[PDB]
Amino acid sequence: MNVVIAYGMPASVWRDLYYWALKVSWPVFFASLAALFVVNNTLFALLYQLGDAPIANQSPPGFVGAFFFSVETLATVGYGDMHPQTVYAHAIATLEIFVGMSGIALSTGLVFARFARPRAKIMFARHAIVRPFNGRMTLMVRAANARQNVIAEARAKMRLMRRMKIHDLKLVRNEHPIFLLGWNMMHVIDESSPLFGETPESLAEGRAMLLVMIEGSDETTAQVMQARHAWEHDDIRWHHRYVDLMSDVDGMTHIDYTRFNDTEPV
Amino acid sequence: MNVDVIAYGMPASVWRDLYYWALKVSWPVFFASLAALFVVNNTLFALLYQLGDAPIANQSPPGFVGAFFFSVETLATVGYGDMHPQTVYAHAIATLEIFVGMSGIALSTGLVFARFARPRAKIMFARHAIVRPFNGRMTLMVRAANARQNVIAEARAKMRLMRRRELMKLHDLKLVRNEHPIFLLGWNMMHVIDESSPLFGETPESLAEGRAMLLVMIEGSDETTAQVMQARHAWEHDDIRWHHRYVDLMTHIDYTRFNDTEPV
Amino acid sequence: MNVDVIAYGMPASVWRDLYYWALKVSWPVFFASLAALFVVNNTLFALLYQLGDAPIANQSPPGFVGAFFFSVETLATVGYGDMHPQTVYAHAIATLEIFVGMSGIALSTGLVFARFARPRAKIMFARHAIVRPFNGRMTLMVRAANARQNVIAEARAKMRLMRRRELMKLHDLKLVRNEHPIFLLGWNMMHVIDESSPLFGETPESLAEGRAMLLVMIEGSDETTAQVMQARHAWEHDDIRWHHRYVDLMTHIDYTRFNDTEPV
Amino acid sequence: MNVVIAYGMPASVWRDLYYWALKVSWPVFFASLAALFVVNNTLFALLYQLGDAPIANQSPPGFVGAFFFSVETLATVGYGDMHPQTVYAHAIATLEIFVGMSGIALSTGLVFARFARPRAKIMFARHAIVRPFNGRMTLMVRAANARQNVIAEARAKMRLMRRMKIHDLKLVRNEHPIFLLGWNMMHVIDESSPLFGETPESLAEGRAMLLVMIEGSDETTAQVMQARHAWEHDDIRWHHRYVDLMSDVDGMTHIDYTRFNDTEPV
Numbered sequence A, D: 001m002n003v004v005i006a007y008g009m010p011a012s013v014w015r016d017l018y019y020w021a022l023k024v025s026w027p028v029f030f031a032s033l034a035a036l037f038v039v040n041n042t043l044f045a046l047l048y049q050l051g052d053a054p055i056a057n058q059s060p061p062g063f064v065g066a067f068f069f070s071v072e073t074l075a076t077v078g079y080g081d082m083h084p085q086t087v088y089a090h091a092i093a094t095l096e097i098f099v100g101m102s103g104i105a106l107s108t109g110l111v112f113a114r115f116a117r118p119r120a121k122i123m124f125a126r127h128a129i130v131r132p133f134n135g136r137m138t139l140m141v142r143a144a145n146a147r148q149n150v151i152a153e154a155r156a157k158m159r160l161m162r163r164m165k166i167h168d169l170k171l172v173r174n175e176h177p178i179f180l181l182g183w184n185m186m187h188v189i190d191e192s193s194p195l196f197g198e199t200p201e202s203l204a205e206g207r208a209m210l211l212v213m214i215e216g217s218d219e220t221t222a223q224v225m226q227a228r229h230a231w232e233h234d235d236i237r238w239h240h241r242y243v244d245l246m247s248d249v250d251g252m253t254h255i256d257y258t259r260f261n262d263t264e265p266v
Numbered sequence B, C: 001m002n003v004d005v006i007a008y009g010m011p012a013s014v015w016r017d018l019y020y021w022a023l024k025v026s027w028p029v030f031f032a033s034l035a036a037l038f039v040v041n042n043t044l045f046a047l048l049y050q051l052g053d054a055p056i057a058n059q060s061p062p063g064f065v066g067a068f069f070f071s072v073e074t075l076a077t078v079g080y081g082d083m084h085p086q087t088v089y090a091h092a093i094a095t096l097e098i099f100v101g102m103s104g105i106a107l108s109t110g111l112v113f114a115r116f117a118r119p120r121a122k123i124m125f126a127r128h129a130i131v132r133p134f135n136g137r138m139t140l141m142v143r144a145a146n147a148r149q150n151v152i153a154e155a156r157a158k159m160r161l162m163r164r165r166e167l168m169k170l171h172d173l174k175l176v177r178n179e180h181p182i183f184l185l186g187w188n189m190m191h192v193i194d195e196s197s198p199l200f201g202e203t204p205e206s207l208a209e210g211r212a213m214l215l216v217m218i219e220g221s222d223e224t225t226a227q228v229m230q231a232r233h234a235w236e237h238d239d240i241r242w243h244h245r246y247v248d249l250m251t252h253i254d255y256t257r258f259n260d261t262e263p264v
């Protein structure tokens, strides 16, 4: 196809910062660096004014000159129009360089660290269904590859949480070969099923919860991406079916996602 | 917890799509693209410079072309120094252009490695599959082999069948061998079509009738990067040749005759 | 195929050992180390400069200190230009110093990210394990929980036993549950000591006699980087408390009382 | 613990170059870049001499000056002592910059690409053994973590190749919890074993070969590193045993590898 309150576990402001460094959006990433870039120069520019006769030909003479020189020395561009006169000028200048490169290095580190973030995301049907299939009462939930990055050859595990014990639900099929389109995961509610004999009311009574999870590899980076979804009992629709998301035209069949989490009683 | 075919209807943000091409594109095209992006980036600042008169000291050649060739100076952090921001505004732009430039380099480099990271070892499959009498029973075979310079040995495989039923039921075809130790040469994967086989009793015509499809998939690790590379192939029913055999490539092996067969 | 305790007696090349510390070391120490490596690197070239007289034009302060502060100029590709290689030799050094410098930056950056790459999510185990009557039978339990900011949910675990036999036989203790869906809080891993259990009929004294040891291991993926992080823990027999229970941390949970127990 | 001739499969000189870029040793890596660095300037320096009056203050006047300016413009250091006079001077200069950065970028890419190479290596005993253990005739081979980087919690698969069919040999233990020391892998040669009833001579007759393979993760990078070893039939020693590689002193037991692949008949 084309197109709770933790208490006692030590947290560090450091790690939290990194977390946002990755969760944040691109535009916000740089703007943040900018606001961090300016701040970094302001700091050295001031550090320069401390000693008089800092940079030769410091223009515009004053703080603004010491600033626009900072940006020069920090990025290793070094025009040379300015030049450390006094020893102290150098001492600062030199220390500012070590900072600058480390500056670049860390940013670049983050920049790639962000690229590394897995790409292929997997959408689940906001609603799950229980419907008579091939004679017996089965349960189904469908998911499908959602980003440009493909996951084919994906395997899945389906669970149940209720009053709090955790039950495994045997899937009719555990792995899916050509996931590149969509997947309709389903679990038969026969004698062995932990769900056997459980009316919609019987679920609520025990605060039931359905947990699915699909793992698979991004064929493009080898990164093994996993994704997870949870349904509340009031999110399972009884005796419903998934609106078919796959038309056909000119002998060519396509698949419309526009109506992905939509259902219709049987 | 806190301390104390084709698809339609997809998202598809322009950003992500751009990155995708940044990786799918070929090397030459990668850089040329940057070039065309590099020029564009300077043109933009050069213009931004002309806005204020007396921008760069000794701006030669005096005019737009000078402001351009200065841009390339300030953006790459090379900074000859022949030019120099005179007016405050000159600096304001210059300084903002630097932050951009480095970020420029950083992103490119990020992409550059992001491309290196792409898994390397590719696995070719025989454009044609076969069903032939082997050791008494009617078995099915398809062969694949490591294709790039990067090796995959110790590779495991899963073989599937897709047909229409009463929906496209996906069946697991039991392979005679699931894993292959020394894959460094080639692999002849095969599935016996006995009583248990979902393919048992199915004439070539019987396949078409249900739009049958064979899906194989081989996973294994690139011993050189540890990257676990997977590859996949699909055969249509008219791509299975009946009562055929794979021409023995082979001490010399002629991978040219890889997907070639001969009736028994 | 071509087209057409402590250990002794180990290899341990100095290079690899250096890299190991490059990653084990703490951030502050990382840079300071580079600094001390940065200075050293210039001192070396500055001296290399003094060898030939009339090295850098306008070398200020005239003397070694000038040749130093020029080094830092030429090594970081900042190149103010106040100084300039006069003599040919000046250039020869200067040019060779540049190749070094960039390689300098490149390697550092390489390390810098190589450190970022280090898996983040860490998993703490209860310093003490317990054996207690649960649901009728004598079972054994140990609990662990996600410890860093980075989450591991959907984690699976393997539990082992090491004792001396007639060699240190390694036995697999069947866990009541092998995988845990929502690990985002905590996990209470437990193994029933019935007839099949290799621990069946073994008094606390019976353990020591054979130098018993409990080895657990939890694997799971950091949902944020896809990196599959594993963690491991070992208990000595005197670290198992008999007929005890884990103090319920818990809506608030006090992870401070994590490895605390109370007899039943 | 502390301390064949392929014919028809397309190869590209490109890919082959990268392969060496990673297989090569560090010193050789850079020297190679150097020799590649010089070459790169020589090329532009010449490209400069084509047009007269290339770089202002081109010292030493001549080719050597155009060279030492190249190194200036290529590394984005740009002293500024030299400066493109003629338009052509710039045209070259500008094109040389785009190259230079791409230069750095690719090198850095390689530099990290090398760091990424898995680290933890796993040594196998050059010799394997078949010895009476606990009554029955079993076969053993030992391996142990070899680099500074640890693999614990390692699993292994053992195979047999003979006249050419490939047999799986059931290991007494498939996975090893605390691999941080050493591992003695062993396969009982009872009725079910494909090796049952096979004298050392019986092996050779069919060109037997033993293939082991251990996979496990580097707890430090999450990289799942695998390693592989092969024994010829004349590399299996019969009725031998592995010299014990684990002494004890002061109540503290250590492990000497100095005698790792050494054996002694029973």
Ligand SMILES: [K+]
Binding pocket: A077, A078, A079, A080, B078, B079, B080, B081, C078, C079, C080, C081, D077, D078, D079, D080
């Ligand atoms: K300069």
Ligand SMILES: [K+]
Binding pocket: A077, A078, A079, A080, B077, B078, B079, B080, B081, C077, C078, C079, C080, C081, D077, D078, D079, D080
């Ligand atoms: K400069």
Ligand SMILES: [Mg+2]
Binding pocket: A075, A076, A077, A078, B076, B077, B078, B079, C076, C077, C078, C079, D075, D076, D077, D078
């Ligand atoms: Mg520079």
Ligand SMILES: [Mg+2]
Binding pocket: A057
């Ligand atoms: Mg001036």
Ligand SMILES: [Mg+2]
Binding pocket: B058
């Ligand atoms: Mg002039």
Ligand SMILES: [Mg+2]
Binding pocket: C058
């Ligand atoms: Mg002066």
Ligand SMILES: [Mg+2]
Binding pocket: D057
């Ligand atoms: Mg001069």
